């Protein structure tokens, strides 16, 4: 799910050719605003991961009786930096970053049971008070019979860190996307960069046009169904009674 940054910039030359970002007026060659371009591209990738799933992750929480709030932050995760004031209880899963948890979706115990999320008055309900924290009531401990939990959530990749010495290559960086959403990302970046420039009648609408094309492309990807889509088929016949 990777692409060389080199290819991306070479292609974005073909749509940013009007403006400062990539061209000297004479002998149009890429400038050194590459930092700003990278900062825009990362935002574009995050937006695409918002619009389509494209990824999902997993954790594993080791419970501790009498605890009320379990935050999911990269200071509690094994292999991260062990801040002394916190006990590292997240013992397994994808390395956690600042933007990794877009939404928690499933909670599965060690017994194979499936608990309920934000479904009030359900038998064993788990509540998220702050979108990245699990609040576990005492009734859960009363009737849990589970020493650990498995969490699944919608992910977004962690962008690679650029550096002033890394300005040498900038071409070994790898964006994390399938190529389809590359074609879409091009329009996103072009719109964002071209918006605040131009004073002529036809040159003041390029940002708007690129936004329109971006939306059209997203709709086309949805129609072609090039993203993950689970579909549920319960049993309903093993409960005992529907047969």
């Amino acid at each position: 799910t990777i692409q060389l940054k080199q290819v991306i910039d070479l292609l974005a030359e073909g749509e940013l050719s009007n403006i400062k970002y990539v061209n000297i007026d004479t002998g149009a060659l890429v400038l050194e605003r590459v930092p700003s371009l990278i900062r825009a591209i990362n935002l574009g990738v995050l937006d695409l991961h918002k619009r389509f799933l494209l990824k999902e992750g997993m954790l594993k929480i080791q419970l501790e009786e009498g605890r009320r709030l379990y935050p999911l932050r990269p200071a509690y995760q094994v292999g991260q930096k062990p801040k002394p004031g916190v006990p590292q209880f997240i013992t397994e899963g994808n390395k956690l970053g600042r933007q990794s948890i877009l939404k928690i979706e499933k909670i599965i115990g060690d017994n194979g049971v499936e608990y309920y999320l934000n479904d009030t008055w359900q038998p064993l309900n788990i509540t998220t008070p702050e979108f990245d924290v699990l609040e576990i009531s005492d009734e859960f401990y009363c009737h849990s019979s589970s020493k650990t939990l498995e969490v699944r959530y919608r992910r977004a990749p962690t962008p690679m860190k650029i550096c002033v010495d890394n300005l040498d290559s900038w071409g070994c960086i790898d964006i994390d996307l399938p190529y389809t959403h590359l074609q879409a990302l091009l329009y996103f970046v072009a719109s964002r960069c071209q918006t605040p420039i131009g004073f002529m009648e036809n040159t003041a609408q390029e940002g708007f046009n690129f936004s329109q094309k971006y939306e059209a492309e997203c709709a086309n990807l949805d129609a072609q169904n090039l993203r993950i889509d689970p579909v549920g088929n319960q049993d309903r016949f093993t409960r005992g009674g529907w047969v």
């Binding site: 400062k20 007026d25 605040p196 420039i197 002529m200």
Partner: protein
């Protein structure tokens, strides 16, 4: 003391010549180039202004 002003004096055909027309066009190009280098001109107003001028 009679130097005859000629078409060469006005402008020689080369782009980088020393004719008055050539150097005026060059300075206009430089100003527009700096304007485009700053985030203020697209690559089409650059042509429009020159052709008008």
């Amino acid at each position: 003391a009679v130097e005859p002003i000629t078409i060469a004096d006005l402008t020689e055909v080369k782009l980088d010549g020393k004719g008055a027309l050539d150097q005026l066009l060059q300075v206009t190009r430089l100003h527009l180039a700096k304007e485009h280098d700053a985030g203020r001109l697209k690559g089409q107003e650059y042509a429009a202004v020159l052709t008008g001028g």
